[PDB]
Amino acid sequence: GIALGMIETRGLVPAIEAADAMTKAAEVRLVGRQFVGGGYVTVLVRGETGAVNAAVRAGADACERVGDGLVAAHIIARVHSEVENILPKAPQ
Amino acid sequence: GIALGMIETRGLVPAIEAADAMTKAAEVRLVGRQFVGGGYVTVLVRGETGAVNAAVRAGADACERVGDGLVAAHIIARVHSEVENILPKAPQ
Amino acid sequence: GIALGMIETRGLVPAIEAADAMTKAAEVRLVGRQFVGGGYVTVLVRGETGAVNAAVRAGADACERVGDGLVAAHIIARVHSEVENILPKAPQ
Amino acid sequence: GIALGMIETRGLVPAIEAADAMTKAAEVRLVGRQFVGGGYVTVLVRGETGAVNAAVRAGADACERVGDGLVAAHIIARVHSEVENILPKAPQ
Amino acid sequence: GIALGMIETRGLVPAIEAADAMTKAAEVRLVGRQFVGGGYVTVLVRGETGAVNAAVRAGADACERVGDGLVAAHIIARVHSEVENILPKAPQ
Amino acid sequence: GIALGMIETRGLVPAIEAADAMTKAAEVRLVGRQFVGGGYVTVLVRGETGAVNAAVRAGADACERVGDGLVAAHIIARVHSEVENILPKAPQ
Amino acid sequence: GIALGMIETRGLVPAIEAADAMTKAAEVRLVGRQFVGGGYVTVLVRGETGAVNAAVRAGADACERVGDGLVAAHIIARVHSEVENILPKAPQ
Amino acid sequence: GIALGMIETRGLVPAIEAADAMTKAAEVRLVGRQFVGGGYVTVLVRGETGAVNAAVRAGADACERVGDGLVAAHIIARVHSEVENILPKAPQ
Amino acid sequence: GIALGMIETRGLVPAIEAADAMTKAAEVRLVGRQFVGGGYVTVLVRGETGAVNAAVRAGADACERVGDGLVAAHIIARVHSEVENILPKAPQ
Amino acid sequence: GIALGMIETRGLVPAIEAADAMTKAAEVRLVGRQFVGGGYVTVLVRGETGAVNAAVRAGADACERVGDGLVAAHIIARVHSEVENILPKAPQ
Amino acid sequence: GIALGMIETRGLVPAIEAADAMTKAAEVRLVGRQFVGGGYVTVLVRGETGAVNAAVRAGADACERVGDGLVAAHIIARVHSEVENILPKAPQ
Amino acid sequence: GIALGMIETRGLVPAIEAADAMTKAAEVRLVGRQFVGGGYVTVLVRGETGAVNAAVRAGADACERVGDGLVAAHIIARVHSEVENILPKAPQ
Amino acid sequence: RITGPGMLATGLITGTPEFRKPELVCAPRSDQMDRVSGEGKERCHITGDDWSVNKHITGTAGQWASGRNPSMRGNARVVETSAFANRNVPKPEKPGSKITGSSGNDTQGSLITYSGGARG
Amino acid sequence: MKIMQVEKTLVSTNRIADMGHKPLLVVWEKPGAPRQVAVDAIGCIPGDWVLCVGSSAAREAAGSKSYPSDLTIIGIIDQWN
Known part of the structure; x- marks a missing residue:
């Protein structure tokens, strides 16, 4: 898929809950989980546009209350070709 | 078991006390201690769903006021196979 | 070109959104991203001085509310040859 | 020595002062120091229950007014076998 | 050239502006850029006392409004031999 | 050279100023510059208790209002043998 | 993709903006632009159904306040075979 | 020569005045003049982002109160490569 | 399983009803029936933590209204080894 | 390991909870579980004075609400040699 | 048992009372009595740190009301070797 | 060394605490504990000026709230040869 | 009713589905902070054919960049744990020395602490 | 004012408390010349050809009108033989 879905959260517990909620909601691929530092954890999912819309909504609903x-x-929906260099491809 | 239980704390002293209560409480295994950065430290335990519920409740109650x-x-209770890529398998 | 454009955001999600907006709204090339620490995530672009100006305004508008x-x-517009050392040559 | 005593401080100078006060006060072994991140530094000592309580009380008093x-x-007093996997065996 | 000129800023963007102003204003060489952690970014220049005086003053003015x-x-004015071990010898 | 003197500061510019004053004030060797995290930067010196007493005192006034x-x-003055394991040996 | 997404505007300038917005927004290909007459300019895209929905939403918002x-x-979401005759296939 | 600046007018006399003011203000080609129909005449210029911004601003001022x-x-500033097809290459 | 469930009742008839209800409710092996004296009778079961939670709920309900x-x-959820010496192994 | 800690409870369930919590808290060996009669159950443990104080606190808190x-x-902290003739040494 | 516990009193009667209560309270071996001069009498007991703490607390309470x-x-908890020369080595 | 450090306290328990603090806080050798009469006890240490400064400061703080x-x-810092006659050579 | 680990933590657990011509060309430095700080700054009024854009001109930076991608902004609990944030932490009573003799006993200088926290 | 060269740092632990925490250096007019001690206001590495002030002027350069200083380094010479 080409669409990118990102959910940043304060801590790794909401991020893991948000990353489980995403991949359970639609056909998305958890391409990365980055420790931004300062206590922010970002999870990026890649997939078709329709699936990414569903995955991110589930993730947001799931982590609003956790931690x-x-x-x-x-x-x-579609990321620029230049930006693809600053995105993960495997889940790290 | 595969049920995942997470406790996040501000500092490491709360994290170690939480981990002690979780492992002491139920049949869970300490699988990782993550330094999220910004003074957030997460402890992850895997076990059967009944065991993890007891372990997590003990950890929250034990470290609630520590540090x-x-x-x-x-x-x-069940993490998607995608999320397994971002969960530590053993602690170091 | 030689002009250098920078947008700094708290977290990674606004930075990825900014980087997408810059490269989409002008003829700039995303040279790299830097995790400064404590939350700050910087995105750098190089291009013509006119194109980069329109790219950094669009990026600011795009990420102003994200996250x-x-x-x-x-x-x-001109970057001293000494500063060129500390700028990422390309996204690693 | 199987009991664990932890002192957490804001900065490294209070941590080293706590480690010095803790080790000189009672018969304990400084098993490690961890940079938790966010400006928190934990110093850990392993010893007997009587020795550890004397050390930690000496440590808390020493580093209370430093930094x-x-x-x-x-x-x-008792650290589960699993918890020891997330504890430094020997000082760095 | 032995004088040292350091400017610390909250974020990379103000630092990069400071580096540009410092090196453009005088005959100083950028020796390093450091991410202290928590947001601070320090840029260091080595040159003659006069050049470093003009560079740091030029840099401090340029980046006051940035980020x-x-x-x-x-x-x-002159750095002790011991401190030379903790200063970058050339930009990262 | 068995007396330890530490100066902790917010940011790196105060740390280098403190280090410079500490090493120009007495015959103290700069053994460390540790980025604790969250901004804190600590400078550790070793020497005779008299020389380290004078070094730290001179450094404190130098960096009190820097950054x-x-x-x-x-x-x-006399650091326990246990604490020596966590102390650095060379500034690099 | 087989899904068609059309945006109609009063004048060419909004249409070109709508076309740019749609192509940049999601993964759609700009099949063509039509001059209906009487001041109406229709621009069509093709892509997967979820990409076209995201594209058309971006195009509608961008061109609403232009001209x-x-x-x-x-x-x-799907175009009958007969309709394909009256659709531009490749842009001029 | 990548930036695109379009001015749309109700009639041709405003378009000629706009196309005259635009080309006089900055270095921009008059790539096209389109008769959209219904009394709409769209004039397009291509140049540098800095030049185009000056041209369009000048053109809108000269034609606002004409006809x-x-x-x-x-x-x-940068039209998607797909949209480049539906643009006019030359004004003839 | 090593989780331990215990039900204490006044009289033996409630205890037998409890032991019967607990064994039938979930995977819990009856391990002992101890006469505490003074009217107290206790029935102990072992099983997985999840099973013991279901069995104990059933046993508590079964013997609530008996005698x-x-x-x-x-x-x-987990019983220390030292306490195993004061737990019946098989009913006698 | 001389200090004696005893917890007396009404029934055997609160006594087993006290024994588990007492033994989990610190290094105390469980020496006896005595059925006094009339519903009283007494659990005696033995160990170092520091450990016993920790153990009894955990037991009193754990079994306060049970049953x-x-x-x-x-x-x-030390029993007279005469009293040990009435203290259990192994639990039966 | 190398920890040192001391009780000071005005008059010998509380000192003798304190020593009786301290020795009987916990496992501390009386090590000496010293007439400071001016009515101050000090009794020193050695032993394990946990036991020595319990003894001193017991002695303080018992001797407070007397005289x-x-x-x-x-x-x-750990008396430095230099101070061991001034402490009594045994009661005479 | 020849520097002298003296702490006088009302009683022996404060004096012992100071002597413990002095000797373990710096490289100084305890040379005497003299009962002056009237409740005053004076602990004398000898060493180099830097070590004596550190020790006495540590000793003064430790025994301030004791007894x-x-x-x-x-x-x-330097003691006249005449005074050396009265100063105790070694503890009794 | 039924004590145990399931009764310990109340309300602290989550995820359990358990059943049941101005005078100066450049505006005052204080007046405004430029959206684009360096070399794009518009605080100085550059007449002529600058690259500035009016309201009449609609495009590139603005609504058109912001509204391209959907976004949800949650109200996170944000507390910064940094050295600067801790600059105002509650600190205990500052140590004071009753020392006598010539020891360079200076209290005007920055707080110097010895082993155990004693001032010096 | 005098031109001197810093040779080594001088440590006096039991100095009077009025001196504050200002470091002291051993400055001499030329190598082999008489050695004097100067309060260091602007930090000098050993071997620096420093410029020192004397008299009541020294007390002000030491950071306070009441400072007990007779010689106070006030500047470092950019280029000195």
Whole structure:
């Protein structure tokens, strides 16, 4: 898939809950989980546009109450070719 | 068992006390201690769903007031195979 | 080109959104991303001085509300040969 | 020595002062120091229950007024076998 | 050239602006950029006392309005031999 | 050279100023510059108790109002053998 | 993809903006642009159903406030074979 | 020569005045003049982003109070490669 | 399993009903029936933590309205080895 | 290992909970589980004075709410040689 | 048992009372009695740190009401070798 | 060395605590514990000026809140040969 | 009713589905902070054919960049744990020395602490 | 004012408390010349050709009008033979 879905959260517990909620909701691929530092954890899923919309919604709903909570839940239907260099391809 | 139980705390002293209560309480195995950064330390335990529920409740109750305190205590009965790529298998 | 554009955000999600907006809204090339620490995530672009200006304004508008938001936005039309060392040559 | 005593501080100077006070106060072994991140530094000592309590109390008093301060002081008389996997065996 | 000129800033963007101003204003060489952690980014220049005086003053002015801003602008006329071990010898 | 003197500061510019003053004030060797995390940067010196007493005192005034300021200024005349394991040996 | 997404606007300038927005937004290919007459310019895209929905939403929003405005924004998830005759296949 | 600046007008006399002011203000080709139909004449210029911004701003000022008037002034610093097909290569 | 469930009742008839109800409710092997004296009778079972939670709930309900009734229902997710010496192994 | 800690409870369920919590807390060997009669159950443990104080605190807190409840929590740092003739040494 | 516990009193009667209660309270071996001069009498007991703490607390309570009273109560878990020369080596 | 450090306290328990603090806080050799009469006890250490400064400061703080308290805390950096006659050569 | 680990933590657990011409060309430095800080700054009024864009011109930076991608902004509990954030932490009573003699006993300088926290 | 060269740091632990924490250096006019001690206001590495002030002027350069200083380094010479 080409669409990118990202959910940033304050802590790794909401991120793991948000990353489980995503991959359980639709046909998405957990391409990365990055420790942004300062206590932010970002999970990025890649998949078809329709699936990514569903995955990110489930993730947002799931992490709003777990731990410090949800910082951002974002969808990019198609990312620019340049930006693909600053995105993970395997789940690290 | 495969049920995942996570406890996140502000600092490491709460994390170690939580991990002690979780492992002491039920038949769970300490699978990882993550330094999320910004003073967030997460302890992950895997076990059967009944065991993990007891283990997580003991950990939250034990470290609730130890040190800076407790951020989150979550239980996931079945994690999607995708999320396994981001969960530690053994602690170091 | 030689002009350098920078947008700094708190977290990674606004940065990826910013980087997408910059490269989509002008003829710039995303040279790299830097995890400064404590949350800050910087995205750098190089291009013509006119194109980079339109790219950093679009990026600021795009990430201003995503997640925690935007910290800084910059253009340095000429970059001293000394500063070139500390700028990522390409996204690693 | 199987009991564990942990002192958590804001900064490294209070941590080393706690480690010095803790080790000189009672017969304990400084088994490690961890940079938790976010400006938290945990110093751990392993010994007998009587020795550890004397050490930690000496540690807390020493580092209370040094640097930003003391965050947490904790004693675990019995550490589960699993928990020792997330504890340094010997100082760095 | 032995004088040291250091400028600390909250974020990379103000630092990169400081590096540009410092190296453009005087005959100084950028020796290193450091991510202190928690947001601070320090840029160091080595040159003659006069050049470093003009560079740091030029840099401190340029980056005052950029991003979070300036933390410290400090000039050391001459650096002791011991401190040379903790300073970068050439930019990262 | 068995007396330890530490100066903790917020940011790196105060740390280098403190290190420079500490090493120009007495015959003290700079054995460490540890990025604790969250901004804290600590400079450790070793020497005779008299020389380290004078070094740390001179450094504290040097960095009190450089950057964000000073956090700690600690001298340990006789450091336990256990603590030596966590102390650094060379500044690099 | 076989899904058609059409946006109609009053004038060419909104249509070109709508076309740019749609192509940049999601994974759609710009089949063509039509001059209906009487001041109506229709622009069509093709892609998977979820990509076209994201594209048409971006196109409708972007071109709504440009020039005379947006007339029609319609998505056809599947186009009968007969309709393919009256659809531009490749842009001029 | 990648930026696109379009001015749409109700009639041809405003378009000629706009196309005259645009080409005089900055270095921009007059790539096309389209008769959209219904009394809409869209004039497109291609140049540098800095040049195009100046041209369009000048053109909108000169034609606002000529004939039926100005409909739309738009600038796109980088049009998607797909949209380049539906644009006019030459004004003849 | 090693989780331990205990039901204490006033009289033996409630205890026999409890033991019967617990064994039938879930996978719990009856391990002992101890006469505490003074009217107290206790029935102990072993099984997985999840099974013991279901069995103890059933046993508590079964013996609540029998004779003098129930006194204590307790679940221990993990029992220390030292306490095994004071637990019946098989009913006699 | 001389200090004696005894917990008396009404019933055997609160006594077993006290024994488990007492033994889990610290290094105390469980020496006896005595059925006094009339519903009283006494669990005696032995160990170092520091461990016993920790053990009895855990037992008194753990068994306070279980069943009929806790009767007595008592510590004797050293018993007279005469008293040991009435203290169990192995639990039966 | 190398920890040192001391009770100081005004008059010998509380000192003898304190020693009786301290020795009987826990396993501390009386090591000496010293007439400080001016009415101060000090009794020193060695033993395990946990036992020595219990003894001193017991002695302080018992000797407080007797005679002129209690002046001080102290424990040192590890007395430095230099101080061992001034402490009594055994009661004479 | 020849420097002298003296702490005088009301009683012996404060004096012993100071002597423990002095000797373990710096490289100084305890040379005497003199009962002055009237409740005053004076602990004298010898060493180099830097070590004596550190020790007495540590000793003065430790015994301030112990027993009746601290009377005097003096540091004579060089001691006249005449005074050496009265100063105790070694502890009794 | 039924004590045990299931009764310990109440309300602290989550995820359990358990059943049941101005005077100066450049505006005052204080007046405004430029959206684009360096070399794009618009605080200085550059007349002529600058690259500035009016309201009449619609495109590139603005609504068109912001509204391309859907976004949800949650209200996170945000507390910064950094050195600067801890600059105002509650600190215990500052140590004071009753020392006498010539020991360079200076209290005007920055707080210097010895082993055990004693000032010096 | 005098031109001197820093040779080595001088440590006096039992100095009067009025000196604060200002470091002291051993400055001499030329190698082999008489050695004097100067309060160091602007940090100097050994071997620096420093410029020192004397008299009541020294007390002000030491950071306070009441400072007990007779010689106080106030600047480092950019280029000195």
